[PDB]
Amino acid sequence: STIEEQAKTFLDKFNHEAEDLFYQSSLASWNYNTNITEENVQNMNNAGDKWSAFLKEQSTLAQMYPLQEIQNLTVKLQLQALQQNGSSVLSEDKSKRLNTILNTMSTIYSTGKVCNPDNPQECLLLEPGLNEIMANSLDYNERLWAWESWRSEVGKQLRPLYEEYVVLKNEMARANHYEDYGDYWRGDYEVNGVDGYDYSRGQLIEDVEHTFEEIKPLYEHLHAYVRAKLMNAYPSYISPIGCLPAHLLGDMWGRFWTNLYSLTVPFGQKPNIDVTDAMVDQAWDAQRIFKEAEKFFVSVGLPNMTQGFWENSMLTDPGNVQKAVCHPTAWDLGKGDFRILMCTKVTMDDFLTAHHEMGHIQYDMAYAAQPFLLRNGANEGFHEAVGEIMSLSAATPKHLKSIGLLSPDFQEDNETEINFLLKQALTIVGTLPFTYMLEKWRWMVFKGEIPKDQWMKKWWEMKREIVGVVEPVPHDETYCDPASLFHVSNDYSFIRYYTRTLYQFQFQEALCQAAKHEGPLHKCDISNSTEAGQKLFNMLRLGKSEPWTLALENVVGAKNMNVRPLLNYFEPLFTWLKDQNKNSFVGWSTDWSPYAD
Amino acid sequence: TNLCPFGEVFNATRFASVYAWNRKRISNCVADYSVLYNSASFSTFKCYGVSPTKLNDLCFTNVYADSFVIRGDEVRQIAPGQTGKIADYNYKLPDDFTGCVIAWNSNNLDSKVEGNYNYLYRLFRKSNLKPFERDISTEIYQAGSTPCNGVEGFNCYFPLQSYGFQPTNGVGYQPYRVVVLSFELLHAPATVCG
Ligand SMILES: *[C@@H]1O[C@H](CO)[C@@H](O)[C@H](O)[C@H]1NC(C)=O
Ligand SMILES: *[C@@H]1O[C@H](CO)[C@@H](O)[C@H](O)[C@H]1NC(C)=O
Ligand SMILES: *[C@@H]1O[C@H](CO)[C@@H](O)[C@H](O)[C@H]1NC(C)=O
Ligand SMILES: *[C@@H]1O[C@H](CO)[C@@H](O)[C@H](O)[C@H]1NC(C)=O
Numbered sequence: 001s002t003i004e005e006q007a008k009t010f011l012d013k014f015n016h017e018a019e020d021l022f023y024q025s026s027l028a029s030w031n032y033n034t035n036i037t038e039e040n041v042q043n044m045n046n047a048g049d050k051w052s053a054f055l056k057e058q059s060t061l062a063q064m065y066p067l068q069e070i071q072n073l074t075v076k077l078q079l080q081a082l083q084q085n086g087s088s089v090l091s092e093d094k095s096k097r098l099n100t101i102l103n104t105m106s107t108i109y110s111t112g113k114v115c116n117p118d119n120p121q122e123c124l125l126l127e128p129g130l131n132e133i134m135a136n137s138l139d140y141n142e143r144l145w146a147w148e149s150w151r152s153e154v155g156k157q158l159r160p161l162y163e164e165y166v167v168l169k170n171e172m173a174r175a176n177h178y179e180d181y182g183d184y185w186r187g188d189y190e191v192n193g194v195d196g197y198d199y200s201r202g203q204l205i206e207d208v209e210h211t212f213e214e215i216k217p218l219y220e221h222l223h224a225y226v227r228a229k230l231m232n233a234y235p236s237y238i239s240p241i242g243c244l245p246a247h248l249l250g251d252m253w254g255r256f257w258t259n260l261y262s263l264t265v266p267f268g269q270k271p272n273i274d275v276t277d278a279m280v281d282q283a284w285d286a287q288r289i290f291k292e293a294e295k296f297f298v299s300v301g302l303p304n305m306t307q308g309f310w311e312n313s314m315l316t317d318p319g320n321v322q323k324a325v326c327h328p329t330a331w332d333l334g335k336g337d338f339r340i341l342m343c344t345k346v347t348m349d350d351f352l353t354a355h356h357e358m359g360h361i362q363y364d365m366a367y368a369a370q371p372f373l374l375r376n377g378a379n380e381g382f383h384e385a386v387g388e389i390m391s392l393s394a395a396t397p398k399h400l401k402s403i404g405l406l407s408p409d410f411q412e413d414n415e416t417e418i419n420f421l422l423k424q425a426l427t428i429v430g431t432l433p434f435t436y437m438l439e440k441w442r443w444m445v446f447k448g449e450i451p452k453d454q455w456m457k458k459w460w461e462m463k464r465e466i467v468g469v470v471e472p473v474p475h476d477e478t479y480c481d482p483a484s485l486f487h488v489s490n491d492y493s494f495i496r497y498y499t500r501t502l503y504q505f506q507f508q509e510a511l512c513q514a515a516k517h518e519g520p521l522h523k524c525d526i527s528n529s530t531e532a533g534q535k536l537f538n539m540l541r542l543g544k545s546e547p548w549t550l551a552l553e554n555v556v557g558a559k560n561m562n563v564r565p566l567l568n569y570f571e572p573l574f575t576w577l578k579d580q581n582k583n584s585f586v587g588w589s590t591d592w593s594p595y596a597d
Numbered sequence: 598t599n600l601c602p603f604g605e606v607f608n609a610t611r612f613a614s615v616y617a618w619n620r621k622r623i624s625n626c627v628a629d630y631s632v633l634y635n636s637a638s639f640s641t642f643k644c645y646g647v648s649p650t651k652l653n654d655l656c657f658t659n660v661y662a663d664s665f666v667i668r669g670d671e672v673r674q675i676a677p678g679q680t681g682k683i684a685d686y687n688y689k690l691p692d693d694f695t696g697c698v699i700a701w702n703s704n705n706l707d708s709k710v711e712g713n714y715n716y717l718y719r720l721f722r723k724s725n726l727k728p729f730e731r732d733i734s735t736e737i738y739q740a741g742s743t744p745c746n747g748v749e750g751f752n753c754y755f756p757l758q759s760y761g762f763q764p765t766n767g768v769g770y771q772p773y774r775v776v777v778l779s780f781e782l783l784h785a786p787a788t789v790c791g
């Protein structure tokens with residue numbers, strides 16, 4: 001009788017049909033990524049739009065149940081996840097303009113290419129050409145060319161598309177009774193209707209600013225040391241007090257700083273830990289890499305990969321006849337089908353990525369008992385953080401000794417510890433100002449706190465002051481530099497990376513203290529720690545059936561994103577940098593320019 | 598003193614749908630269940646009321662072997678006193694149950710590429726099923742009170758859904774052929790015995 005039971009019956013039918021339609025979608029897309037044939041891309045597209053038309057029809061049917069008269073917040077979260085009609089709440093004229101805008105932007109990204117003025121014939125796509133250029137060049141000018149030319153040839157095409165796109169996204173958002181599209185996005189972090197654990201869509205903005213406040217000291221110290229090394233590598237192109245140029249950050253935008261290790265390594269003669277040769281010498285194969293990742297997970301208390309994972313996974317690149325996209329990827333096809341697609345090499349890096357993807361698989365296995373609509377990360381940042389902590393605690397020298405892969409006479413020391421930690425900080429800390437600043441610019445643009453006539457003017461300001469990075473060339477209002485990045489021009493929200501980084505070190509410190517680990521947080525190896533296993537699984541098993549604040553409290557005993565565990569993890573490196581910085585300026589002044597001479 | 602065709606009951610070409618769950622009435626035979634127990638080819642063999650060891654020479658009037666295919670995850674619902682879709686709306690086991698549940702994976706027979714959709718389970722019902730009652734009804738389940746007049750639409754559904762049984766399914770989503778035995782009690786002579 002009651003409307004509650006109408007919603008219940010509706011979801012009970014939707015789940016049992018959406019399951020199989022999504023499974024067909026998934027098998028078709030898998031068979032594609034495994035064996036690229038035009039037969040297969042066609043089967044893929046067919047099943048894809050079948051399931052998409054189904055969920056549009058179901059969204060229509062679902063909006064016939066007002067959110068008012070429902071109390072069960074499980075039922076209400078499912079009805080809300082479905083009822084979110086999206087572009088279908090627009091007039092089909094406007095939805096058409098929207099989707100041609102979106103596809104035009106995606107293709108201007110993917111098919112974009114930059115050409116040298118010396119030769120109108122030969123020129124380069126982004127990956128691998130320009131990505132490898134920016135990742136490996138030690139030359140100032142050629143990196144500058146890759147950077148500025150990719151921004152001036154692909155971004156300027158996306159600028160007006162991005163303006164029209166933000167207009168129609170704001171209208172689609174205000175037509176869904178959100179305030180803006182940025183608000184639509186932060187709706188991923190909203191909790192309503194649970195006393196004490198709720199969260200509003202501006203509380204996220206203030207929380208992220210607050211945690212970034214405490215991260216500013218560590219990042220300033222690391223930024224100062226990295227600037228010191230980079231000037232001992234780029235004598236005339238970096239100032240001791242100014243900000244870091246954007247093209248010299250190891251890739252096209254500066255998102256991660258990994259590629260600066262060979263320039264910032266503290267002990268440039270003490271060796272890294274690179275254990276590929278120990279896998280070579282002992283007849284380790286892909287089966288061995290993944291058997292060791294599986295065993296590392298059973299050590300902590302999580303179950304092992306199921307037989308279907310062994311049968312159906314593409315674990316090695318399968319020859320020259322059949323083609324496949326070798327992006328390491330974990331697959332939940334639904335219906336109990338968990339697989340991995342990864343062209344495995346015999347390398348330390350792939351050895352670790354095995355643990356990462358297996359952690360993705362373990363998160364997927366954890367919440368697969370939830371209702372279909374609630375089979376996801378507790379919020380948009382939990383999956384990848386769960387994946388990353390396993391890579392951490394599997395790259396530990398004591399872990400490499402416990403598995404016969406390093407000699408017990410290996411000497412851990414100040415040298416190896418500061419090496420590992422500075423590499424880690426290049427990858428993990430150098431991305432937090434970037435991620436925070438990008439999503440802040442996007443939010444401010446969707447809310448309208450930046451008129452389009454000042455779009456770029458605000459971008460490169462939030463760079464100079466939040467990330468300590470300056471653009472190497474003046475960028476007027478025709479660029480849309482933000483969209484030269486994938487996630488912007490491809491309509492993906494970004495703050496997942498900030499929240500994920502912070503959550504991963506919160507989880508890490510929590511699981512390490514549950515491990516009774518003594519000594520610095522980096523040496524922590526949660527293997528053989530069933531306590532870390534229970535503490536991680538108590539959050540894993542939830543999915544988005546609970547407010548992400550509650551699940552976060554299930555692991556870290558705090559109700560909200562916190563940055564004390566991250567600073568704790570980087571404490572040894574923190575004080576080493578403080579010793580290295582005695583007679584150098586920590587912090588940057590946002591006035592110096594690469595191009596104002 | 599002949600043998601009851603236990604093979605076909607376990608070996609039939611394609612099984613029946615759980616909503617119209619097939620029933621065999623096994624009578625007047627010799628039946629040593631020892632081989633079925635220790636066949637070690639069944640992934641689940643749970644006897645409720647008397648353990649599989651002794652039932653070889655406890656003497657029954659007449660036994661029913663219900664058979665169907667469900668998902669693996671659903672096998673637990675075939676247990677006296679459970680809840681869920683398969684337990685409430687397709688096949689309900691009474692808590693005073695006596696016979697056993699014999700589930701074995703059939704990812705190779707009952708599943709096939711592109712999915713084997715021949716099996717159906719009833720997803721909705723205006724009331725729970727009684728023990729052992731079979732509902733084959735096909736009348737559009739009315740979620741509200743707005744009449745539907747025998748055609749699907751909004752708030753009215755077809756109460757029969759199909760399993761999609763591919764061979765790449767997980768062990769819980771894999772077609773599990775389930776044979777349930779419930780033994781009877783009567784003062785008429787016990788005829789299934791030995
Ligand atoms: C690869 O694709 C062809 C045609 O698309 C198909 O017939 C073949 O079975 C595929 N390979 C495998 C191993 O399935
Ligand atoms: C919400 O619904 C689920 C399944 O529909 C049920 O198990 C749960 O008890 C309900 N919550 C409340 C508070 O009744
Ligand atoms: C995982 O380990 C348990 C331990 O007995 C074992 O029973 C199970 O079969 C293992 N998983 C697989 C896929 O074999
Ligand atoms: C985990 O425990 C096993 C049990 O013998 C041991 O062999 C292994 O070295 C331990 N590894 C770690 C990292 O504690």
Ligand SMILES: *[C@@H]1O[C@H](CO)[C@@H](O)[C@H](O)[C@H]1NC(C)=O
Nearest residue numbers: 603604605606607608632633
């Ligand atoms: C089903 O057939 C196999 C194949 O011979 C046989 O071993 C088995 O006993 C049969 N099932 C039953 C219940 O007898």
Ligand SMILES: [Cl-]
Nearest residue numbers: 253481482484
């Ligand atoms: Cl940029």
Ligand SMILES: [Zn+2]
Nearest residue numbers: 356384387388
């Ligand atoms: Zn990942």
